[PDB]
Symmetry: D2
Subunit: 122 residues, 4 copies
């Protein structure tokens, strides 16, 4: 239940997600903090029966960077865990793969990390 | 879709996926070929209008490792691209995050790569 | 050299490095509290003539986790860039590979990130 | 020592390394099939007392992509393990960080993998 809702990364990106009872993640990712042409479908999965020993809840999701307005020919996956409580966060690593020719495939995939919180960053 | 169908990685895993018209990926991932207790839901996204310059098709998907037989409290995301043709492949990089305590979060995420082909490996 | 000297990550590790004139990094990495038994040799390379247009200085280094007190049969590489100024930092992503059997090689490599600053975290 | 010597990746890059008695890696990396302009210093570390249970030998090294001829303002770290025997290999994953502005730091780091063998590929 703690996953469903709006999350903000450290750079101002926004995503809104619904965590389904059986493990589905569905929602929208906005690469800005207020822009229509910047909204993309996201889908993912999470552990719907996490451990109760204080461990985080494992999850992942994907955004393909095509919407009705733009197509970057690329897709980002986020892999991480949800941690609940007063300082709730989703801590993630991500991979962003661009469609490339075979010659350029070696440089097709960027890697980074995002920390999502329930409140916007300053 | 050249994407819709069954794919095998180089280690004995398989997945079956349907690529929807507007960019959905839906299917099942089987970590051990010939073992239905190792089948898990997969969901993801792909570029439904890739570039016309011979570039690959960017995609990503997630598997949370919970089914009726197992809960590993973990999730893997695969990020990559599909290349069509006689030697069709999905070339990926993946991130496997386990739910952990805060103290153990530094070692929560494994990284690797998978190459999927339409035919089983050796 | 803005790189030469002592750096602290976000979690209580320290390293001291000398940046040589032509691009060598040499020094010691201490994973712990100020625990001498957690000190390890580090070696790496950096760009000794970075672009002077506000770009960071690319660098990388390796620690093999063997010293006189410990052998974890593993090694971490950090890849990142140095950013100078009042809020100087070395922003990195790392890969930690453990020696494994072939059967376990798929889970041999952890991935994460470290931000190093010239002052200790709170 | 089985690490010392010449290794070839899957794409026609070459490196020559000396594994020192107490864990040093020193050598040269050539990204091409031949050419002094494409040769760069490498330095790293390896586990000089690996397990004897059939496990690989953990290692890592860095190449900063500056030599007397070229400067790409970037550096690659390889993290992996050496496996000896009739099919000796060094199995790695790598991170390539480019110096960037702060605005572009999110896309500073590429990730991939290399498999090195003692004999050239195709």
């Amino acid at each position: 239940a703690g996953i469903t809702g709006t999350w903000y990364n450290q750079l101002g990106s926004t995503f809104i997600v619904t965590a389904g009872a059986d493990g589905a993640l569905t929602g929208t990712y906005e690469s800005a903090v207020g822009n229509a042409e910047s909204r993309y479908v996201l889908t993912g999965r999470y552990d719907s029966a996490p451990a109760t020993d204080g461990s985080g809840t494992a999850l992942g999701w994907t955004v393909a960077w095509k919407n009705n307005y733009r197509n970057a020919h690329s897709a980002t996956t986020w892999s991480g865990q949800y941690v609940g409580g007063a300082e709730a966060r989703i801590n993630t690593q991500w991979l962003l793969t661009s469609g490339t020719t075979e010659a350029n495939a070696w440089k097709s995939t960027l890697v980074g990390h995002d920390t999502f919180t329930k409140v916007k960053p300053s």
